[PDB]
């Protein structure tokens, strides 16, 4: 261990776990905002959607199917990290609440996606292929592997891993969410899009929380280190969206995608308290 004695969030010292003397109001209120957005997979009517899945072009189906599987697996990764690391490391109560609520929510997202997949792909053969994306889908490896390094990185700091998970939930998902909102614009798959609105909003909040934790950190990574972790993730997201699973497939412009990722990165950088990196405008009218 380092200088954890110096970190308020980490100093192995609440000597607490009695919840009402509320010390951190900014953290609390985030939990409250979480708690208030609760929802269940059950609240999403997937009943029309099979028709739509039907009236879709193949390319549109390959795309979607792959994204669903990419999200299915990623949520899994997110949760594991929270479970075995974040929620263990952080000592401040308010933060424990938020992370415990986030885990419950990841599980619900995991279920929603599973349902989408099961509802669209009647062929259990496929089903499996997709459930096992980490071991099947190369298009999801890098990303999965990048994120997995951080869980196993036992030499690095919380400040570093917090930034990384914020890149995972906010950068690794950005393109995909955006692609889904694209479909909505085009009037397709209501169930897929309606859920997407819920999920994306949860993830946003999960990103804001991470930036807040970052703020409560004393010893954080140097601004160069942060740029590099962000940058690395941006690149990886761009590649997935234009090469591995090109947005062309649902009629999107790969170039504007690439630029939105960057816009997304710069917003995060600002939330973390740094200058922007790329200085690009948001290209999607609808993502505003």
Could you count the other beta carbons within 10 Å of the beta carbon of residue 148?
15
| 216 carries a ligand binding annotation | no
| Active-site residue, from 113, 120, 158, 260 | 113
Number of residues that make up the chain = 288
Which lies closer to Fe ion via its Cβ, residue 105 or residue 229? Answer: 105
Residue 106 annotated as part of some ligand binding site? yes
Residue 73's binding partner out of a second copy, Fe ion, none, with CB under 5 to 8 Å set by partner kind: a second copy
Q: Are 177 and 196 in contact (CB under 8 A)?
A: yes
Token pair of 145, please?
A: 């592997």
Q: Is 145 in the site for a second copy (CB under 8 A)?
A: no
Beta carbons within 8 Å of 75's beta carbon, 6+ residues apart: 106, 109, 110, 113
Neighbours of 67 (CB within 10 A): 27
Is 120 tagged catalytic? no
Q: CB–CB of 271/208 below 8 Å?
A: yes
Binding of Fe ion by 220 (CB under 5 A): no
CB neighbours of residue 118 within 10 Å: 15
Indicate whether 40 belongs to the interface with a second copy (CB under 8 A): yes
Residues 50-89 that bind a second copy (CB under 8 A): 72-73, 76-77, 79-80, 83-84, 87-88
Determine if 114 is a binding residue for a second copy (CB under 8 A).
yes
- Is 203 flagged in the annotation as binding? yes
Q: Which of 96, 206, 220, 258 binds Fe ion (CB under 5 A)?
A: 206
Catalytic sites, residue numbers: 113
Which residues contact Fe ion (rule: CB under 5 A)? 78, 106, 206
């Amino acid at each position: 261990n380092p200088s954890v004695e110096d970190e308020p969030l980490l100093r192995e010292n609440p000597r607490r776990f009695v919840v009402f003397p509320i010390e951190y109001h900014d953290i609390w209120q985030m939990y409250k905002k979480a708690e208030a957005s609760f929802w269940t997979a059950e609240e999403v009517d997937l009943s029309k959607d099979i028709q739509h899945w039907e009236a879709l072009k193949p390319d549109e189906r390959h795309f979607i199917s792959h994204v669903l599987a990419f999200f299915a697996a990623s949520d899994g990764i997110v949760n594991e990290n929270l479970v075995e690391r974040f929620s263990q490391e952080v000592q401040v109560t308010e933060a424990r609440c938020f992370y415990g609520f986030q885990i419950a929510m990841e599980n619900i997202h995991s279920e929603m996606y599973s349902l989408l997949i099961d509802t669209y792909i009647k062929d259990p053969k496929e089903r499996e292929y997709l459930f096992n994306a980490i071991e099947t889908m190369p298009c999801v490896k890098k990303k999965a592997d990048w994120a997995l390094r951080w869980i196993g990185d036992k030499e690095a700091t919380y400040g570093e891993r917090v930034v990384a998970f914020a890149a995972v939930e906010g950068i690794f998902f950005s393109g995909s969410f955006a692609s889904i909102f694209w479909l909505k614009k085009r009037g397709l798959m209501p169930g897929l899009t309606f859920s997407n609105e819920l999920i994306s909003r949860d993830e946003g909040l999960h990103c804001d929380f991470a930036c807040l934790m970052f703020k409560h950190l004393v010893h954080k990574p140097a601004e160069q280190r942060v740029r590099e972790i962000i940058t690395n993730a941006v690149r990886i997201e761009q590649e997935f969206l234009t090469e591995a699973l090109p947005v062309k497939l649902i009629g999107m412009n790969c170039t504007l995608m690439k630029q939105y990722i960057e816009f997304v990165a710069d917003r995060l950088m600002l939330e973390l308290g740094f200058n922007k990196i790329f200085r690009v405008e948001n290209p999607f009218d609808f993502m505003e």
